[PDB]
Amino acid sequence: SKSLSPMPQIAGVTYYGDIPKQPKRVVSLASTYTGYLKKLDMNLVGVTSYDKKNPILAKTVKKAKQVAATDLEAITTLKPDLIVVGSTEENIKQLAEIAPVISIEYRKRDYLQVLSDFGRIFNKEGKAKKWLKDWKTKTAAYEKEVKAVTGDKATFTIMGLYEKDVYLFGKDWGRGGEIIHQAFHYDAPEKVKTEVFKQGYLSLSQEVLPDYIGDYVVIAAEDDKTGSALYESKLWQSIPAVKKHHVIKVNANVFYFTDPLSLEYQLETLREAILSSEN
Numbered sequence: 001s002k003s004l005s006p007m008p009q010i011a012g013v014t015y016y017g018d019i020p021k022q023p024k025r026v027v028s029l030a031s032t033y034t035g036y037l038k039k040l041d042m043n044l045v046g047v048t049s050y051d052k053k054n055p056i057l058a059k060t061v062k063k064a065k066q067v068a069a070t071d072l073e074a075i076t077t078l079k080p081d082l083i084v085v086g087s088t089e090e091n092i093k094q095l096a097e098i099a100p101v102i103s104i105e106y107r108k109r110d111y112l113q114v115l116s117d118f119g120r121i122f123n124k125e126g127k128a129k130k131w132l133k134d135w136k137t138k139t140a141a142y143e144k145e146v147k148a149v150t151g152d153k154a155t156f157t158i159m160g161l162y163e164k165d166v167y168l169f170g171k172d173w174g175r176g177g178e179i180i181h182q183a184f185h186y187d188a189p190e191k192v193k194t195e196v197f198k199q200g201y202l203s204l205s206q207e208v209l210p211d212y213i214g215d216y217v218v219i220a221a222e223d224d225k226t227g228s229a230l231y232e233s234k235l236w237q238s239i240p241a242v243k244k245h246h247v248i249k250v251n252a253n254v255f256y257f258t259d260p261l262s263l264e265y266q267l268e269t270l271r272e273a274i275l276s277s278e279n
């Protein structure tokens, strides 16, 4: 049998079976976590559709098969020694019959803690610590670069276009919020702090958008055509941030994510976009 993880008790983490310390064949069924596992040098043999559509992550998991959580046959034949899932997955019991499962309830640990937590689970503390120390220094330095341009108290709102809907996001639901609010310590407008932050996200009617945007807005979308009718509208064009050219449009295919690999890309992209807003 496998050498075992110490399986620490961590908020949000549930273990099904004996988790290996050094898994050799991991199936990741939760896009939140795939890039954390890659950062810690795990061999991923299965990943999700969102993972494959994230160009930053996809480059690192070319040999992994795309699978869904219902793919019991394909997952079995991948011969995993570990499966990682989100806690809301429909069929964790069936997955745990195939291999040991780590199930994570989102948001119980923050985007940085998740990495050091995996460091404890897999005895990869050094790799996690090195990344986290560098991240702390780099983000503080970049925070200075961007606030030099905007002012330290400029407000930012995180937004996404999805289907025909409009979402706002807080500090810990992807779409750039970790970078903008946690890494750069930008404030959000009061209405976003009150109505969005605790909730994580808020699906909004388009006509009230002006009320939620202050100095800057970051907008994630999967395709560059989705926002067209909104963007040309008098409503949108009346927003001071829009008039100032403080709209930052980003590609959701990577910006949905919160993992170290995706966030490295988001960090550089957002730094450059803020600087570019004053070109």
Ligand SMILES: O=C1CCC(=O)N(O)C/C=C/CCNC(=O)CCC(=O)N(O)CCCCCNC(=O)CCC(=O)N(O)CCCCCN1
Binding pocket: 031, 032, 050, 086, 088, 106, 162, 167, 172, 173, 174, 201, 256, 257, 258
């Ligand atoms: O984990 C993150 C950031 C936070 C996040 O989006 N999560 O889903 C984490 C798990 C949240 C707890 C379970 N909640 C839900 O499943 C509710 C639906 C959901 O995924 N949400 O994010 C809620 C707001 C978005 C709803 C519309 N769906 C999308 O934007 C698809 C991309 C979308 O939201 N996805 O999750 C697929 C890509 C995600 C890449 C990893 N990103």
Ligand SMILES: [Fe+3]
Binding pocket: none
């Ligand atoms: Fe989500």
Ligand code: NA
Binding pocket: 112, 182, 183
């Ligand atoms: Na933080």
Ligand code: NA
Binding pocket: 222
């Ligand atoms: Na999608």
Ligand SMILES: [Zn+2]
Binding pocket: 143, 184, 185
């Ligand atoms: Zn700060």
Ligand SMILES: [Zn+2]
Binding pocket: 229, 232
């Ligand atoms: Zn039109």
Ligand SMILES: [Zn+2]
Binding pocket: 242, 243, 245
């Ligand atoms: Zn203009």
Ligand SMILES: [Zn+2]
Binding pocket: 244, 245, 246, 277, 278
């Ligand atoms: Zn400006």
